[PDB]
Symmetry: C3
Subunit: 450 residues, 3 copies
């Protein structure tokens, strides 16, 4: 049968001490709630009902593009009251999974096992074993089925030793949710309508409640502060790195590796310590990444070596190219195959042709460089004052001498040669040699003040 | 009643294999003994008696500014002999706390609980539970009070299983210290006068010895080598990062964060992995720090973003400024609000006015730059040979073309425009345009040697 | 008696998902098998028989210089079949130790204890205790001697609780290996000739099998995938850092330190977080290394400070020199005593004389710089097009003004002074002052387009 998801995300998150609502704080560069919405989407949810309240405006701006049904809960009357806000949109013959925006590491595989175990007209309750279950609702099984969730304050000596506890995550059909939520009361110390009470209501109706144990505790762990958030981040990062290592990526130290998006990789990829991968990154075969690199939204061809402390963003690098150390690729940098980018070099919105080298103390911006060019140390592409970034065009096999200024708009045709310390403001012809005529004063017997 | 502290710091620290005495090795950029002196100061100690011996000269130069009473112990005759060196300066009606220069993580909160529990004319002994208490003096309690500290070699089978052990940290009044220290003998295998013996002496006098358990084992842990020192450092760093995370600082990875001084922060501050904070650092609201940054004695206004691999020292940064990646702020760098400092840029002892940009491959030293200036790539402020760093003055709304040399002493007035590749040695007037007249040799049909 | 070693290294290593055979994947910059060959060499092995099969060509190219006897096993018929391939080369009266190319952390000290315990005409079997010994061959001792290795599938309830397990590492004389290997059968579920069977064969001959327990489990741990390889790497790195810390090296964080070769050090050396040491590195006394540095095949004299994010390779640095932050030393960089190399500076195959400073945005390549020179910001050594890296010679006490281009081949004699923004193509005489005569157009009342 069909499936829809409900995500609780109305929490203030007071203990984060932030202007952001609780669920917008990120895990691996992504808001906590976005992990949940994506997991719900990978399950095949027709609808994803997002229960929101605190920081409504911020939720809407940060999650504007999410395919969710925005359900405002004006008052936090309890988790059952929150689910009931979305209940008029539940299809009677569809399954509904209840998730929490601040417990983001819940897996598609655990939820699939939970949905699968759900008995007809009953509930599938997600449970977990804790070494210290103190404070949590103990799961009581009788004839294999969950008969009660016994709270810490109510449990007897024997029940206190039960390690299996309630996570709040559950699956039931829409009609059963509509029916039971209308029957939840708030007669307890907190005066709240608890979704927990649906287990007692199911048993009252002689409907079966089946327990499904989660793989890891960290999957159901919520973050109430930035310390807990950091623990979720380390667990998530270690999980991503282990999957990569088992896929054949040589990550020198999985404890000093960060993936904040997606990684597509070839075989024999080597990633040194303190590397950060952001957005959508694709590495070809035998790519080597040196210590301290940051790759954001990049495409790296086969056999590329990125030497230490290189920062690349919205760039493309061709096969056998050599980058770094200390290279900066800014958005629009397109390096063809067998290119060379060295230390203290900045490339921005420029194309660099096959075999070309830009190895030292250079700025290349809004330029087109052909194949087999030699861009000398200290070369800078610049503009006139009041200009609107006008473009530098360099053809094939051009030599640009050290410390030359290329003043855009300007073209340098194939095979041209530019001498060191030149100011290029006018177009250079095919095979034109341009050298600066220097005037110098020479004074003999100049005794230095030493 | 009043309080004074005694700190034992006469140890050679042979196993550190250093020319430094034991207590001068640092934890979080601060000598071990300095943590103890600061803790003693935060308690409200009138006097802090520093027992020193080994590396006396080095102790005096490294701790010249400390408000302590320098007490030389010429021979290490034991911990009781060391305390007795300071005993003539103990006030009879003041409390005395005994601390160790090589056990630096002892907290003010633990010591406050220790002082509070001290019975009149008695001792408050600091204790700790160990999973493996092997080698340590077992605490024997009878009617709630400490009757003996039983050494490993003397303990019976039942006593060997006692997990509560002696830390050496204790509080008593000055008159009781004077009285008991004069009664300590050295009749034992080591021939030393042990401060431990004061517990047996207190009981002999029918004075009460009360045990106070420490929060963590690491608080009372001593460092005898650099491996143990490193373990204290990791524990201390993790403790600082957790406090920050609970205060609302987003530290991406607390295991890759280092605070070596003090941090003052606003709300919604984000600190990426491998960031080092040194000296006195103040961050405004929503400051973002990219991976690999080093901030030493800096003030950062609200909404500043520091991009990866930026190194800042003795600098001030105004609100909404953008720094890095690969920026270097040296002492005296003052960036006004909404400024821009980019890759491979070095700023030293210079002021940079509101909205001004210095985005590439530039050195700015001993300069004053006004508001809304554009400092082109490759611009360098320099001096003549034999000069004494003479100062560059740039007014408001100045354009400085790429690869220009500003030869100090020199002034460039408001609205001036300097063309690329210029050598400025003479003052530039308000709205003066200065461009280089270039001479070039152009040779057609120059076939490159390829 | 004499000793020879046999190393099993014929494995495909399918779960690494690599084009490399299993044993060539590195630990601390060295192939797994190379650690084993080096350990075997430090024991005093006359011969090291390398059993190889999978990726034969790659094994031979990567280990071309190893003093081993290359033994091809065309089919993996079992570990006993592999050892038997080398058995015709075993001396009857020499000891033979059996090692595994994919279990690289085995120590010389453990193997020495194993050889020592070997009874005449018997076997010394290396064993280890596991908390969970599930799947491993349980060691059965009777009268102190190993009577059987009981496999998981065969063990009774009582035997399943035995924590002591077989590692596969063993020592026996050559004649006993020849005799027993010829008697190993393949009658088991896998149809393989197991070296394990030699224990049962030894007992059949009334020869004694003595168990020797390894120091750590990690010493005998094999790597079947890159995740396991990463765990071996972390254990190895932590082991190297602890030895260094106990030797007196101040490593700020041993969890963020990497040694991939050898380190020779003086006293009071300080190494900050995220430092990588590669090849053969020698540090003098009181060397300080800032965060993020990479030192490969370097020699660093006493009292040198390397400031953050500096990358050095095949270089020599004299005493009291100051390097970084953001410095790049490329192969052949030789810095004399009391030199200064600053941010965004690249030195390649050049000598830099005593007291000389190269502090900003500079490239120095194929140069000889004398003593007490001042190399201004933006200075670049370059060549003509079609040149073959021709060399720049700078004498003593030379001032080179900011943004000067030194066009090789060229000499600048003692005491010469070069003004800022100069192009040097011709030799400069002793005490010659060379300054650029500039031509400039000055336009008054130039209103900027703002
Ligand atoms: C952040 O938005 C919300 C979150 C939650 C919530 O209860 N989240 C949550 C649930 C369970 C766990 N689980 C664990 O941490 C756990 C469980 C078992 C073992 C170990 N750990 C964590 C977070 C409830 C409401 C919400 C409440 N009340 C209302 O009225 N409206 C709402 O939206 C809102
Ligand atoms: C470094 O200067 C000194 C230090 C100490 C000293 O004993 N320090 C110390 C004391 C206790 C601990 N505690 C633990 O490590 C511990 C305790 C319980 C559980 C776990 N860990 C550590 C260091 C004693 C003298 C000194 C000695 N003798 C003299 O004659 N003069 C002196 O100054 C000098
Ligand atoms: C990689 O090359 C090989 C390796 C091995 C091999 O068996 N290696 C190995 C042996 C023991 C362990 N030990 C553990 O992991 C361990 C043990 C006890 C406790 C904990 N861990 C690890 C690796 C065998 C052959 C090889 C096999 N068969 C053939 O026919 N030819 C060969 O070369 C080849
Ligand atoms: Mg320049
Ligand atoms: Mg120039």
């Amino acid at each position: 049968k069909a499936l829809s998801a409900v995500i609780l995300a109305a929490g203030k998150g007071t203990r984060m001490y932030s202007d952001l609502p609780k669920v917008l704080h990120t895990i691996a560069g992504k808001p906590m709630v976005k992990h949940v919405i994506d997991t719900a989407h990978q399950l095949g949810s027709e609808n994803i009902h997002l229960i929101y309240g605190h920081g409504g405006d911020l939720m809407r701006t940060h999650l504007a593009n999410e395919q969710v049904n925005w359900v405002l809960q004006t008052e936090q009357l309890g988790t059952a009251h929150a689910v009931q806000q979305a209940a008029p949109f539940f299809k009677d013959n569809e399954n509904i999974v209840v998730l929490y925006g601040d417990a983001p590491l819940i897996t598609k595989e655990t939820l699939e096992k939970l949905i699968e175990a759900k008995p007809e007209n009953g509930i599938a309750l997600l449970t977990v074993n804790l070494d210290n279950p103190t404070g949590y609702g103990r799961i009581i099984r009788e004839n294999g089925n969950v008969v009660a969730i016994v709270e810490q304050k109510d449990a007897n000596a024997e029940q206190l030793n039960i390690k299996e506890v309630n996570t709040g995550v559950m699956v039931s059909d829409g009609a059963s949710f509509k029916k039971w939520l209308a029957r939840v009361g708030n007669n307890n110390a907190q005066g709240e309508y608890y979704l927990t009470d649906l287990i007692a209501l199911a048993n009252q109706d002689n409907c079966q409640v089946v327990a499904v144990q989660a793989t890891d505790v960290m999957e159901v762990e919520g973050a109430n502060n930035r310390l807990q958030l950091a623990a979720l981040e380390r667990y998530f990062q270690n999980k991503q790195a282990s999957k990569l290592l088992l896929e054949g990526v040589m990550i020198y130290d999985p404890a000093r590796f960060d993936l904040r998006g997606t990684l597509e990789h070839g075989k024999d990829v080597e990633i040194d310590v303190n590397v950060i991968i952001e957005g959508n990154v694709k590495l070809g075969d035998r790519v080597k990444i040196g210590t301290g690199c940051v790759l954001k939204n990049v495409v790296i061809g086969n056999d590329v070596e990125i030497k230490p402390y290189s920062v690349l963003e919205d760039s493309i690098v061709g096969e056998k190219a050599a980058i770094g150390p200390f290279s900066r690729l800014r958005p629009g940098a397109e390096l063809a195959a067998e290119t060379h980018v060295g230390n203290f070099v900045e490339i921005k919105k420029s194309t660099v042709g096959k075999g070309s080298k830009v190895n030292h103390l250079t700025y290349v911006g809004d330029s087109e460089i052909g194949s087999n060019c030699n861009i000398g140390a200290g070369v800078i592409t610049c503009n006139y004052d009041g200009a609107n970034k006008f473009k530098t065009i360099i053809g094939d096999d051009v030599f640009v001498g050290s410390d030359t200024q290329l003043v855009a708009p300007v073209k340098v045709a194939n095979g041209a040669t530019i001498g060191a310390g030149t100011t290029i403001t006018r177009d250079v012809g095919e095979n034109e040699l341009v050298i600066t005529r220097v005037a110098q004063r020479h004074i003999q017997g100049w005794q230095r003040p030493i």
